[PDB]
Write a protein that holds these residues in place. Structure first.
Motif, PDB file in Angstrom:
ATOM      1  N   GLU A  23       0.819  -1.206   0.000  1.00  0.00           N
ATOM      2  CA  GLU A  23       0.000   0.000   0.000  1.00  0.00           C
ATOM      3  C   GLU A  23       0.854   1.258   0.000  1.00  0.00           C
ATOM      4  OE1 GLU A  23      -3.527   0.240   2.670  1.00  0.00           O
ATOM      5  OE2 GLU A  23      -3.203   2.385   2.787  1.00  0.00           O
ATOM      6  N   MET A  24       1.951   1.233   0.758  1.00  0.00           N
ATOM      7  CA  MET A  24       2.894   2.357   0.784  1.00  0.00           C
ATOM      8  C   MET A  24       3.471   2.635  -0.594  1.00  0.00           C
ATOM      9  SD  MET A  24       5.043   2.218   4.391  1.00  0.00           S
ATOM     10  CE  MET A  24       5.824   0.617   4.101  1.00  0.00           C
ATOM     11  N   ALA A  25       3.851   1.572  -1.294  1.00  0.00           N
ATOM     12  CA  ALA A  25       4.535   1.731  -2.575  1.00  0.00           C
ATOM     13  C   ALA A  25       3.570   1.937  -3.746  1.00  0.00           C
ATOM     14  CB  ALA A  25       5.451   0.526  -2.850  1.00  0.00           C
ATOM     15  N   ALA A  26       2.344   1.415  -3.635  1.00  0.00           N
ATOM     16  CA  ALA A  26       1.349   1.511  -4.715  1.00  0.00           C
ATOM     17  C   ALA A  26       0.431   2.708  -4.537  1.00  0.00           C
ATOM     18  CB  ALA A  26       0.489   0.223  -4.801  1.00  0.00           C
ATOM     19  N   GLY A  27       0.124   3.037  -3.279  1.00  0.00           N
ATOM     20  CA  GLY A  27      -0.861   4.064  -2.981  1.00  0.00           C
ATOM     21  C   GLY A  27      -2.254   3.500  -2.739  1.00  0.00           C
ATOM     22  N   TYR A  28      -2.406   2.186  -2.931  1.00  0.00           N
ATOM     23  CA  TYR A  28      -3.658   1.477  -2.657  1.00  0.00           C
ATOM     24  C   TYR A  28      -3.294   0.072  -2.173  1.00  0.00           C
ATOM     25  CZ  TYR A  28      -2.473   0.181  -7.481  1.00  0.00           C
ATOM     26  OH  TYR A  28      -1.808  -0.221  -8.624  1.00  0.00           O
ATOM     27  N   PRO A  29      -4.181  -0.583  -1.401  1.00  0.00           N
ATOM     28  CA  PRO A  29      -3.798  -1.915  -0.900  1.00  0.00           C
ATOM     29  C   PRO A  29      -3.906  -2.978  -1.991  1.00  0.00           C
ATOM     30  CG  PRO A  29      -5.978  -1.303  -0.058  1.00  0.00           C
ATOM     31  CD  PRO A  29      -5.450  -0.104  -0.817  1.00  0.00           C
ATOM     32  N   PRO A  30      -3.285  -4.147  -1.773  1.00  0.00           N
ATOM     33  CA  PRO A  30      -3.317  -5.221  -2.776  1.00  0.00           C
ATOM     34  C   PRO A  30      -4.725  -5.797  -2.967  1.00  0.00           C
ATOM     35  CG  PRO A  30      -2.328  -5.999  -0.719  1.00  0.00           C
ATOM     36  CD  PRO A  30      -2.463  -4.498  -0.601  1.00  0.00           C
ATOM     37  N   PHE A  31      -5.549  -5.781  -1.918  1.00  0.00           N
ATOM     38  CA  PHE A  31      -6.921  -6.265  -1.997  1.00  0.00           C
ATOM     39  C   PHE A  31      -7.884  -5.190  -1.502  1.00  0.00           C
ATOM     40  CE2 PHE A  31      -3.873  -9.321  -0.302  1.00  0.00           C
ATOM     41  CZ  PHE A  31      -3.723 -10.172  -1.394  1.00  0.00           C
ATOM     42  N   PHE A  32      -8.611  -4.569  -2.419  1.00  0.00           N
ATOM     43  CA  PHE A  32      -9.641  -3.615  -2.018  1.00  0.00           C
ATOM     44  C   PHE A  32     -10.927  -3.789  -2.827  1.00  0.00           C
ATOM     45  CE2 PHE A  32      -7.626  -1.255  -5.490  1.00  0.00           C
ATOM     46  CZ  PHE A  32      -8.716  -0.692  -6.145  1.00  0.00           C
ATOM     47  N   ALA A  33     -12.029  -3.364  -2.225  1.00  0.00           N
ATOM     48  CA  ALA A  33     -13.354  -3.444  -2.813  1.00  0.00           C
ATOM     49  C   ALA A  33     -14.239  -2.534  -1.983  1.00  0.00           C
ATOM     50  CB  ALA A  33     -13.875  -4.863  -2.807  1.00  0.00           C
ATOM     51  N   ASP A  34     -15.510  -2.424  -2.346  1.00  0.00           N
ATOM     52  CA  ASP A  34     -16.434  -1.577  -1.599  1.00  0.00           C
ATOM     53  C   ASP A  34     -16.934  -2.256  -0.326  1.00  0.00           C
ATOM     54  OD1 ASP A  34     -16.492   0.869  -3.006  1.00  0.00           O
ATOM     55  OD2 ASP A  34     -17.741  -0.028  -4.579  1.00  0.00           O
ATOM     56  N   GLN A  35     -17.102  -3.577  -0.371  1.00  0.00           N
ATOM     57  CA  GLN A  35     -17.575  -4.329   0.796  1.00  0.00           C
ATOM     58  C   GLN A  35     -16.520  -5.324   1.290  1.00  0.00           C
ATOM     59  OE1 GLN A  35     -20.092  -3.149   2.245  1.00  0.00           O
ATOM     60  NE2 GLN A  35     -20.567  -1.822   0.494  1.00  0.00           N
ATOM     61  N   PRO A  36     -16.398  -5.474   2.615  1.00  0.00           N
ATOM     62  CA  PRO A  36     -15.424  -6.420   3.186  1.00  0.00           C
ATOM     63  C   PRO A  36     -15.503  -7.852   2.618  1.00  0.00           C
ATOM     64  CG  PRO A  36     -16.267  -5.000   4.911  1.00  0.00           C
ATOM     65  CD  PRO A  36     -17.033  -4.634   3.651  1.00  0.00           C
ATOM     66  N   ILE A  37     -16.705  -8.370   2.364  1.00  0.00           N
ATOM     67  CA  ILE A  37     -16.834  -9.743   1.875  1.00  0.00           C
ATOM     68  C   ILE A  37     -16.061  -9.945   0.572  1.00  0.00           C
ATOM     69  CG2 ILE A  37     -19.034  -9.201   0.718  1.00  0.00           C
ATOM     70  CD1 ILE A  37     -17.595 -12.574   1.893  1.00  0.00           C
ATOM     71  N   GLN A  38     -16.111  -8.948  -0.304  1.00  0.00           N
ATOM     72  CA  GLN A  38     -15.387  -9.010  -1.569  1.00  0.00           C
ATOM     73  C   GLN A  38     -13.872  -8.893  -1.360  1.00  0.00           C
ATOM     74  OE1 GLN A  38     -17.551  -5.554  -2.923  1.00  0.00           O
ATOM     75  NE2 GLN A  38     -18.748  -6.810  -4.353  1.00  0.00           N
ATOM     76  N   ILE A  39     -13.467  -8.093  -0.380  1.00  0.00           N
ATOM     77  CA  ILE A  39     -12.065  -8.039   0.028  1.00  0.00           C
ATOM     78  C   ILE A  39     -11.571  -9.436   0.448  1.00  0.00           C
ATOM     79  CG2 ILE A  39     -10.388  -7.031   1.642  1.00  0.00           C
ATOM     80  CD1 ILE A  39     -12.068  -4.553   1.798  1.00  0.00           C
ATOM     81  N   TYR A  40     -12.337 -10.110   1.309  1.00  0.00           N
ATOM     82  CA  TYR A  40     -11.981 -11.446   1.795  1.00  0.00           C
ATOM     83  C   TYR A  40     -11.886 -12.452   0.656  1.00  0.00           C
ATOM     84  CZ  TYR A  40     -13.701  -9.244   6.088  1.00  0.00           C
ATOM     85  OH  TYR A  40     -13.944  -8.385   7.138  1.00  0.00           O
ATOM     86  N   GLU A  41     -12.738 -12.296  -0.356  1.00  0.00           N
ATOM     87  CA  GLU A  41     -12.720 -13.225  -1.480  1.00  0.00           C
ATOM     88  C   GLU A  41     -11.430 -13.071  -2.274  1.00  0.00           C
ATOM     89  OE1 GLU A  41     -16.289 -12.454  -3.646  1.00  0.00           O
ATOM     90  OE2 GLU A  41     -17.527 -13.719  -2.346  1.00  0.00           O
ATOM     91  N   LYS A  42     -10.966 -11.829  -2.414  1.00  0.00           N
ATOM     92  CA  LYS A  42      -9.711 -11.559  -3.103  1.00  0.00           C
ATOM     93  C   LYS A  42      -8.530 -12.105  -2.300  1.00  0.00           C
ATOM     94  CE  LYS A  42     -11.380  -7.563  -5.696  1.00  0.00           C
ATOM     95  NZ  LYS A  42     -11.017  -6.262  -6.328  1.00  0.00           N
ATOM     96  N   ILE A  43      -8.551 -11.856  -0.992  1.00  0.00           N
ATOM     97  CA  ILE A  43      -7.483 -12.287  -0.098  1.00  0.00           C
ATOM     98  C   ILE A  43      -7.249 -13.799  -0.130  1.00  0.00           C
ATOM     99  CG2 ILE A  43      -6.799 -12.531   2.320  1.00  0.00           C
ATOM    100  CD1 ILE A  43      -8.082  -9.730   2.767  1.00  0.00           C
ATOM    101  N   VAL A  44      -8.312 -14.592  -0.056  1.00  0.00           N
ATOM    102  CA  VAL A  44      -8.129 -16.038  -0.004  1.00  0.00           C
ATOM    103  C   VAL A  44      -7.916 -16.651  -1.391  1.00  0.00           C
ATOM    104  CG1 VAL A  44      -9.589 -16.123   2.064  1.00  0.00           C
ATOM    105  CG2 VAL A  44     -10.586 -16.731  -0.173  1.00  0.00           C
ATOM    106  N   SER A  45      -8.149 -15.870  -2.446  1.00  0.00           N
ATOM    107  CA  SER A  45      -8.082 -16.396  -3.818  1.00  0.00           C
ATOM    108  C   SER A  45      -6.689 -16.879  -4.228  1.00  0.00           C
ATOM    109  CB  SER A  45      -8.551 -15.339  -4.824  1.00  0.00           C
ATOM    110  OG  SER A  45      -7.553 -14.349  -5.013  1.00  0.00           O
ATOM    111  N   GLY A  46      -5.657 -16.260  -3.665  1.00  0.00           N
ATOM    112  CA  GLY A  46      -4.290 -16.612  -4.002  1.00  0.00           C
ATOM    113  C   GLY A  46      -3.701 -15.750  -5.107  1.00  0.00           C
ATOM    114  N   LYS A  47      -4.459 -14.743  -5.544  1.00  0.00           N
ATOM    115  CA  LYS A  47      -4.043 -13.861  -6.641  1.00  0.00           C
ATOM    116  C   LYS A  47      -3.720 -12.456  -6.151  1.00  0.00           C
ATOM    117  CE  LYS A  47      -7.772 -15.038  -8.746  1.00  0.00           C
ATOM    118  NZ  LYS A  47      -8.958 -14.862  -9.622  1.00  0.00           N
ATOM    119  N   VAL A  48      -2.564 -11.949  -6.568  1.00  0.00           N
ATOM    120  CA  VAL A  48      -2.148 -10.581  -6.289  1.00  0.00           C
ATOM    121  C   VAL A  48      -1.545  -9.978  -7.560  1.00  0.00           C
ATOM    122  CG1 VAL A  48      -0.665  -9.079  -4.907  1.00  0.00           C
ATOM    123  CG2 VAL A  48      -1.679 -11.090  -3.867  1.00  0.00           C
ATOM    124  N   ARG A  49      -1.897  -8.730  -7.867  1.00  0.00           N
ATOM    125  CA  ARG A  49      -1.316  -8.025  -9.013  1.00  0.00           C
ATOM    126  C   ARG A  49      -0.511  -6.808  -8.570  1.00  0.00           C
ATOM    127  NH1 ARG A  49      -3.007  -9.032 -14.127  1.00  0.00           N
ATOM    128  NH2 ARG A  49      -2.562  -6.855 -14.712  1.00  0.00           N
TER     129      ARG A  49
END
Ligand code: 8BQ
Lengths: 20, 347
Positions: B227-253
């Motif tokens: 987040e420091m280096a990008a300016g946004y976190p690796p997993f973000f969305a409007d609702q927490p549930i969608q954040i959690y889905e990204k987090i457990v998915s195993g994918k990061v860009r």
């Protein structure tokens, strides 16, 4: 852009902790 | 490289051994009731939480400024944060590290709990990060290094921190980090299960209710550096549930401006597989300290505060709060009846 998507989202303010 | 056990490692071991000795003394006999509300002049609110607020205050007998956290006992009880609040105070009065805010006094009255900490006038990392957009990698590395050493310290005392985020990191007058907000810190050997943290920063094992340990702090470090280096976190969305889905998915860009060393470090920290997550391997924190991205980092010089900071916050005399947002103020009321005495007796 990803940055633009972030900035337009509802989570660029301070984020509350969860614990339930 | 990160496996070697030369003299440098034994210096760290010796340091940590003495640190634990000091910590345990205070852990086993906590300071208690070391000031009273009337000894402080309350000036302005510096931040808020679900069951309290932090105010700038001036100690009358010394004229020192402090940050006083005021927690409403009834609200703590309603949110089932009694034991977590007891954790926070017991741990914070016991620890001592250059990048940890100090608890100077604590006390309670009929209505509230009070924790009087050092005032850190530079404001939250969060404020600066959002305003500037993102930090350069050298700038982010500087802050990251401090968290690495701080977690090395905390983890050696069997502590887990559990709420790393820019909102919880203050910048002092020398431009160095001060970690605050020990509300979820816990002393635990082995494993724990409490669902807590902030959605963007939660490790997958927390989300999946797996039972977890200090490896979640290292995951959170991955999120922070991103987040420091990008300016946004690796997993973000409007609702927490969608954040959690990204987090457990195993994918990061990663942003295309991320260096290959940075992406490599982040892939090892944002590792869903605990048997592969940096900080959680046989070499412990040394996999992180010896990663290529930290090649230029002089860990001792960081600890000694001899490294030149990326920036120094604007300082307009003492008591200035211009680096903090404004919050709505509310008069402190102390009931004539003791609330929740038994629950907070050891505070
Ligand atoms: O205001 C805060 C707060 C308020 C109520 C509960 C809580 F856990 C935290 C914290 C949250 N993040 C930072 C904020 C803060 C703001 C300033 C200081 C400070 O100057 N010294 C120590 N902790 C501080 C903490």
């Amino acid at each position: 852009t990803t940055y633009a998507d972030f900035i337009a989202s509802g989570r660029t303010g301070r984020r509350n902790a969860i614990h339930d | 490289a990160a496996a070697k056990k030369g003299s440098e490692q034994e210096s760290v071991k010796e340091f940590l051994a003495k640190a634990k000795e000091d910590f345990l003394k205070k852990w086993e006999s906590p300071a208690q009731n070391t000031a009273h509300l009337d000894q402080f002049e309350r000036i302005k609110t510096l931040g808020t939480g679900s069951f309290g607020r932090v105010m700038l205050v001036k100690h009358k007998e010394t004229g020192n400024h402090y940050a006083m956290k005021i927690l409403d006992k009834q609200k703590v009880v309603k949110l089932k944060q009694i034991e977590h609040t007891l954790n926070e105070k017991r741990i914070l009065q016991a620890v001592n590290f250059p990048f940890l805010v100090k608890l100077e006094f604590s006390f309670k009255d009929n209505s509230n709990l009070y924790m009087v900490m050092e005032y850190v006038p530079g404001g939250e990392m969060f404020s600066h990060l959002r305003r500037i957009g993102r930090f350069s990698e050298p700038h982010a590395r500087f802050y990251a290094a401090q968290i690495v050493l701080t977690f090395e310290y905390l983890h050696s005392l069997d502590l887990i921190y559990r709420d790393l985020k820019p909102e919880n990191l203050l910048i002092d007058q020398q431009g160095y980090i001060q970690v605050t907000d020990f509300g979820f810190a816990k002393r635990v050997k082995g494993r724990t299960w409490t669902l807590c943290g902030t959605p963007e920063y939660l490790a997958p094992e927390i989300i999946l209710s797996k039972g977890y340990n200090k490896a979640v702090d290292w995951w959170a470090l991955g999120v922070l550096i991103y987040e420091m280096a990008a300016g946004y976190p690796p997993f973000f969305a409007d609702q927490p549930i969608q954040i959690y889905e990204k987090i457990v998915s195993g994918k990061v860009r990663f942003p295309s401006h991320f260096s290959s060393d940075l992406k490599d470090l982040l892939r090892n920290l944002l590792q869903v597989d605990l048997t592969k997550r940096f900080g959680n391997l046989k070499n412990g924190v040394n996999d992180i300290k010896n990663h290529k991205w930290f090649a230029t980092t002089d860990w001792i010089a960081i600890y000694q505060r001899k490294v030149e900071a990326p920036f120094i916050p604007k300082f307009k005399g003492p008591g200035d709060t211009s680096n903090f947002d404004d919050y709505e103020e509310e008069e402190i009321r102390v009931s004539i009846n003791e609330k929740c005495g038994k629950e907070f007796s050891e505070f």
